[PDB]
Ligand binder design. Structure first.
Ligand SMILES: *[C@@H]1O[C@H](CO)[C@@H](O[C@@H]2O[C@H](CO)[C@@H](O)[C@H](O)[C@H]2NC(C)=O)[C@H](O)[C@H]1NC(C)=O
Ligand SMILES: *[C@@H]1O[C@H](CO)[C@@H](O[C@@H]2O[C@H](CO)[C@@H](O)[C@H](O)[C@H]2NC(C)=O)[C@H](O)[C@H]1NC(C)=O
Ligand SMILES: *[C@@H]1O[C@H](CO)[C@@H](O)[C@H](O)[C@H]1NC(C)=O
Lengths: 50, 57
């Protein structure tokens, strides 16, 4: 397990799908907020959809 | 363009992600997008321009 800053990990994840990493870095706050909102939506779905 | 930036404590280098092989940071290793006020964690260094010494001499 080789430690790496999470933002750089996401930069690799973005490069792996054909999106240049500067898109991640310039939009890091937006991406983090979208991730957190998606997780909250997962929580609401699991808490409400039997 | 490929790899990551690394520092040995005094100098910054760029090397491939899966094998340590430090190279001098140049315009042929990196690309420019945006400016210093956007990227979180951006650091100050210098980027060598291989063209400069050819036109200076
Ligand atoms: C980090 O890397 C730089 C680049 O190689 C090192 O600087 C060189 O150090 C050697 C001695 O180990 C000198 O002979 C060279 O002249 C130095 N070159 C430059 C451009 O400074 C630096 O010593 C390295 N730092 C550590 C802690 O290993
Ligand atoms: C990296 O370098 C830039 C300049 O190249 C630094 O920007 C300076 O920031 C101070 C603090 O607000 C200002 O007073 C200076 O006027 C800025 N410089 C310029 C040219 O406008 C930046 O702070 C540096 N960052 C680090 C971490 O060293
Ligand atoms: C990394 O986190 C430390 C706090 O643990 C902070 O002081 C430092 O400025 C941060 N550096 C970057 C590049 O985010």
């Amino acid at each position: 397990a080789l430690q790496i800053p999470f933002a750089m990990q996401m930069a690799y994840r973005f490069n792996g799908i054909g999106v240049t990493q500067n898109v991640l870095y310039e939009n890091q706050k937006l991406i983090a907020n979208q991730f957190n909102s998606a997780i909250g939506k997962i929580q609401d779905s699991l808490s409400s959809t039997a | 363009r490929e790899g990551v930036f690394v520092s040995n404590g005094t100098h910054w280098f760029v090397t491939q992600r899966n094998f340590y092989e430090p190279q001098i940071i140049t315009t042929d290793n990196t690309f420019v997008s945006g400016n210093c006020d956007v990227v979180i964690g951006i650091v100050n260094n210098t980027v060598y321009d291989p063209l400069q010494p050819e036109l200076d001499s």
